[PDB]
Ligand binder design. Structure first.
Ligand SMILES: Nc1ncnc2c1ncn2[C@@H]1O[C@H](COP(=O)(O)OP(=O)(O)OP(=O)(O)O)[C@@H](O)[C@H]1O
Ligand SMILES: Nc1ncnc2c1ncn2[C@@H]1O[C@H](COP(=O)(O)OP(=O)(O)OP(=O)(O)O)[C@@H](O)[C@H]1O
Lengths: 208, 209, 209, 208
C-alpha cells in the first residue's frame, strides 16, 4: 500500500471542478492502467459500496459535510496503512481526486494531510470559454467541447478548449504557475510513473 | 444523471400551479421539441400514468404529515427510482410547488440533504400590474395575465402576455434575492438542463474507455 | 523452538515499513535460500494466507486498543499457536513495526513477559544523507536511498544502496544505544537464527536418547 | 524422597548455560536412568503441568522473576519433604539443574539453600570457541559442535569442543578448579551413585 497521488481541485461553482475531476481520473487511469477505472465516492454515505479497487477515486466537495465524515474518510484514503471501507474490501487506489469550495483548508490536523496532497489546483474558466449565466462568470460548456483537431494525448478522442488553458485554467497553488487540464494530467502521470520506478527498484533490491 | 429541480414557493392563488405548468410545458417544448409533462396525482403512492415524460410536476409538496416529502427525495436521485404502479424515473426536470417559506421535513431527518438537490428556489407572487383584490385578499388577475400583448418572447410561446413578465408575475430567486420574470426562469432552467447534458456527454465520451 | 523477534520502533515515514520488508526478504533469502515472507493483514483476527512462511511481518503493533498485542504474544511462543482462518505457526523470524517509544500493553497485564521475547529492539530514522524535508517534516528520501551505488554488500542484495548504510537509514539498538546499519541488523539476525538452529540440533542429538 | 543433587550454572548471556543445562540433564539421566528424562520448568507458570516424575528437572534463570515465585519453587524442589506442584503429582527428580545470571545469590534464607546446592559452576566459552558477536564475547557455536572423534562417554554420539574445557569452561566456584562439561557430568554421576550406594545400605540394614 504505497501512498496515492492526490490532486485537490479548488474552485467556485460552474467552473468544471467535477467535470475535470472525472476527466482527470478517466484520462490518468486510462493512460497508465490502460482503461478507465474510476470510483466516485457517494455523497453522505460512509459506504464505499461500489468500490472494486478502481485505479482512481473521486471525492466531491471536501469541506462541505458539516460533521467531518469526509476529511476523515479522506485522511484514511491516503495513509500508507490499510483503510477498510464499510460494506471487507481493501483500499488500493493509486490516484485520489477531490474537489472543494474552500480557497484553503481549515476544518488542527489539516497540515498533517497537506503533505499527502500532491497537487493543489484552483480551477476557473479560461478567457475564451468564459460566459455569464444569471450574472455569474462560468465555463462556456458549449464552446469548450467543440472539437478542435487531433487529440493532444492518445487517451483523448480529439482536442477541444476544455483541454487548453484558453478554455479552462488550473492554477498551481504552490508554483503559482497556470497550466491546462492536459498539463494537470501529464504531471499526475509522470509522478505516478516515478512512484512506480522507485517501487520497482525497492522490490528488486533483495534477490529472489 | 440527475434532474434539475425547481421549487416554486409562494402564496396560494399567486400562480404557483399555473406557472409550474407553463414552466414544464415551455422547457420541454424548448428542449424536447414537443410538450412532455407528467402531473403527479397528489394523494397517490402510485405514479399511475408515468410514461417517462420529460418534465414532472408535484402539486403542493408539504402535506400528509410524509409520503410526498420522501417520494420527492427519491425522484431527485442519481440512482434509478422504481415507483409503485416498476419503471425507472427518467425525467430531466422536476417542478414542485409548496406553501412553506422554508423546508424542514419530518421524514427526511437530514433536510440539508434535500437542499443541494434544489437547483432553483423561487417565490411566486402576482406582479403590480396583475394583482386584483378578490374578497379582501390579493390574487393574480389571470385573465389580464394571459391577454396577448404581441410577439412571443421565446419561440415556444405563441404570443407574449403579462404572465411572461415581472410586471405580471414575479419570481424571487430565494438565494440571490433577485426578482425575475417567468421567462427568466424558463431560460435559466434550459441553460442548466442543456449544460448538464453537454457535460454528461463529455464525461462519457472524450476520454477513451 | 521459538522465533527471533525484531521490533522496529521509530517515527512514521522513516522506513519502518520498508526496512521491515527488506529485513524479512533479506534474512529469509540468506537462510532459506529464497524469499519467504508473510505479511499479516492488520485488522484481521484471521491469519488468512498463512503458508508457514519463514519470516512474518506485523505492521503497526499498538492499535485497536488489544487484538494485535495478544496475537503478538501468541506468535512468540515455545508452544504451538493455532491461528484462526488451525495450522501451526512455524515462522523463525518475526518483524514488528510500532510507533511507541516503549511498550506497556493493556491486555498483556504482565508486559515484562513480552520483553525477554524481543531479540532486537531498534529505532529507525532516516540518515543524514537521505533525509529530505517534505511539507515541514523530516522523512526518508527513498529514491535516493535505493539508488544503486555498487556491489551488493551481502549476496542476497543485487546491489548496494544508501538504504543499506547508516548514512541512509539508521537503527539505534534500543538496548546498547548503539547505532548500526540495516546490513548490521540483517547480519545480527542471521547469526541468531543460525545460532539457535545449531543449538537446537545439539539439544536434540548428541546425547543419546 | 531423598535430597536431589543440585547443579547451579552461573553465567553471562550467550555462554551456553541453557544448552549445558539440557545436555547435562540428558547425559546424566541417560547414563544412570538409562534414558533421557528431562523436565524443563515453564517460565512464569507456577504450573508443573508436564511433570511426569522425570529424572532431571531444569530451572532457567533463577533470580530473574522479581516476585520470587522462583527460588521458593526452587527451595521446595530440594527439601527432603514432599513438594506437590499444581495441576496431584509428586516431585521425585534426583537431579536439579538451574541457571542464573547472578554471580552470587541475594534474593535472608539464601544460605539455608546453599547447602542444598551440590555444585556451583560459572560458565564461559573456552578459549578456542570464543567468538565476538555485536561486540560481545560468546561461545562459538558453529565451531564447538564439529565432531572431533569417538565420544568421551557412551551417552554421547561423538566428541566435540563443547565437551572440552578448550571449548566451554566450567569453573567450580568452591574448588576454583576449572573443568569441562564432561567432568561436570562425571562428578554429578559419581555423587548420585554414591547417594544410591548409601541409600541401599540403609534399606538393607533391617532384614525383611
Ligand atoms: N453559476 C453558478 N452559481 C451557483 N451555483 C451553480 C452555478 N452553476 C452551477 N451551480 C450549482 O452549484 C453546484 C456546484 O457546481 P460545480 O462547479 O461543483 O459543478 P461542476 O460539474 O464542476 O460544474 P457545473 O456547475 O458547470 O456543472 C452544481 O451542482 C450546480 O448545480
Ligand atoms: N551476547 C549476548 N548479549 C546479550 N544477550 C544475548 C547474547 N546472546 C544471546 N542473548 C540473549 O540473552 C539470553 C541469555 O542467553 P543464555 O546464555 O541464557 O542462552 P543459552 O542457550 O545459554 O546461550 P545462547 O544465548 O547462545 O542461546 C538468550 O535468550 C538470548 O536471546
Amino acid at each position: 500500500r504505497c501512498e496515492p497521488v492526490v490532486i485537490v481541485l479548488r474552485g467556485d461553482a460552474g467552473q468544471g471542478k467535477s467535470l475535470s475531476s472525472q476527466v482527470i481520473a478517466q484520462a490518468v487511469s486510462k493512460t497508465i492502467f490502460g482503461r478507465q477505472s474510476v470510483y466516485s465516492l457517494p455523497p453522505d454515505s460512509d459506504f464505499f459500496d461500489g468500490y472494486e479497487n478502481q485505479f482512481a477515486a473521486i471525492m466531491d466537495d471536501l469541506g462541505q459535510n458539516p460533521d467531518g465524515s469526509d476529511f476523515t474518510t479522506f485522511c484514511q484514503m491516503v495513509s500508507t496503512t490499510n483503510f477498510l471501507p464499510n460494506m471487507g474490501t481493501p483500499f488500493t487506489s493509486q490516484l485520489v481526486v477531490a474537489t472543494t469550495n474552500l480557497p484553503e483548508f481549515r476544518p488542527a490536523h489539516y497540515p498533517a494531510v497537506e503533505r499527502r496532497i500532491t497537487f493543489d489546483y484552483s480551477v476557473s474558466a479560461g478567457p475564451v470559454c468564459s460566459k455569464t449565466e444569471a450574472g455569474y462568470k462560468v465555463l462556456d460548456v458549449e464552446r469548450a467541447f467543440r472539437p478542435t483537431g487531433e487529440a493532444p494525448l492518445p487517451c483523448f478522442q480529439n482536442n477541444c478548449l476544455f483541454l487548453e488553458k484558453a478554455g479552462l485554467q488550473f492554477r498551481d497553488n504552490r508554483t503559482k504557475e497556470i497550466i491546462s487540464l492536459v498539463d494537470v494530467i501529464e504531471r499526475a502521470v509522470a509522478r505516478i510513473e516515478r512512484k512506480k520506478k522507485v517501487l520497482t527498484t525497492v522490490q528488486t533490491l533483495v534477490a529472489q
